[PDB]
Amino acid sequence: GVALGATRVIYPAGQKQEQLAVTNNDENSTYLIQSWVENADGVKDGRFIVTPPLFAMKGKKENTLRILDATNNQLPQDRESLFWMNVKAIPSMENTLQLAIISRIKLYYRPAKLALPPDQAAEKLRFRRSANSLTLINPTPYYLTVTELNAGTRVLENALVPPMGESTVKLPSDAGSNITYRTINDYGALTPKMTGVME
Amino acid sequence: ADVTITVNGKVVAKPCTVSTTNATVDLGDLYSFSLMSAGAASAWHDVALELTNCPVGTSRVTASFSGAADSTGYYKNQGTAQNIQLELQDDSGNTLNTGATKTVQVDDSSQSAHFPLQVRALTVNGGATQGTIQAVISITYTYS
């Protein structure tokens, strides 16, 4: 059994490294752990190094990966950038199908000196009810992971609203009335329920 | 009367026998962490000067204290230890630094006099460092 310490990673600009824990809770398994970063388009562009890139977990162990910046300040300074951290566990050895597990989590690159702090980003989310759809507007420089989005009693899909951007979900008119939502903060925890402000 | 006799005489105080030629105080081992701050001192150690067989006429003995001192006033440490001085007192809170003198009454019943003294090490400025403690206080008596 392979697990990660976080469901996401924030990388503040200027930091020299960030840590991500990798844990095998199974005494009898032995995996090859292979870790790397991709961009929003799922391409290995080499903006971040992971060290160690490849190692062997034998039995019940823990090892801390370290993500290094290699961007050299060539990213947007005004808002967050989305990358993807990947940790691939390959069980090391009958006509068998044997599976490898990739755990994949968001890696947000956060520039320095943003006006709005993170905690106050959730309450700035706005909506636009029209047709059979619902647009979510995010004026903050942070990626908002919107979850438990209830159009009345009708629970809609989860959303990832980009910074200074929009995101649209499916909406049945044959449904509830008033909007409520929640977000996943930097530490993976749910923020309190907030009333859906429109316009 | 038919004759008058005038007899003239004089009583002069004369030296006693000094028992304690060499008084020996031994402070033992002291500890730097205890002697860190300014005004830190070790435990007092009683030392007695004994004069016996005091001739009749001598009712008092005056001790006169001598020794190499340092800038604190107290007795300099000839040993290797630093920021440490030696203090000599009586039993009435009087410091007997070099040059000072103390007088005691000769006990008539025993025909002898004694000086009850106490000695300790101290650090006036603090920061007593490691090393040996060596000091010798010379003392001579006059009689009256």
């Binding site: 996401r8 199974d26 691939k88 068998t96 199908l97 990739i102 989590i105 749910l190 | -």
Partner: protein, 154 residues
């Protein structure tokens, strides 16, 4: 220089520990021999396998699951078998979800949907694995393979 001990660390809501059951095939060249049910052979006694999400942090209420691997040259969604002298032919391993529908092998993250999980509790994801013919006739041989399961956290 004044004996300060600085202490740092984090408290985070955690992910899940993931453990995938390896599927086994035995058959005894059964269907294979009596197959040729067209190229839509599309049958073998399905062998089930689970992916166990346990334990799980209080965060996880939804994940994006998907399979990837070396696809079949004839069928995009069939997982190609091993190609060696021991191996069989005219067969790709098909991966079926809980509702016995085919899983789009090597699909993009936009194609995939969110599987809802029960926060805190352990969660079991159920799948099936069978063999589907891609050529008439199939031949006798080994049926080993390897694929990658992918968990994307919300």
């Amino acid at each position: 220089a004044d004996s300060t001990i600085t202490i740092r660390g984090y408290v985070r809501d955690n992910g899940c520990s993931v453990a995938a059951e390896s599927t086994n095939f035995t058959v005894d060249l059964m269907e294979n021999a009596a197959k040729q049910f067209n190229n839509i052979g599309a049958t073998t006694p399905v062998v089930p396998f689970r992916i166990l999400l346990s334990p799980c942090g209080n965060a996880v209420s939804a994940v994006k699951v998907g399979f990837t691997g070396v696809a079949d040259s004839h069928n995009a969604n069939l997982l190609a078998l091993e190609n060696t002298v021991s191996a069989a032919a005219g067969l790709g391993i098909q991966l079926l979800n809980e509702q016995q529908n085919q899983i789009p092998l090597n699909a993009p993250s936009s194609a995939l949907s969110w599987t809802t999980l029960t926060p805190g509790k352990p969660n079991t994801l159920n799948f099936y694995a069978r063999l589907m013919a891609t050529q008439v006739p199939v031949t006798a041989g080994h049926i080993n393979a390897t694929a990658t399961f992918t968990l994307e956290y919300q």
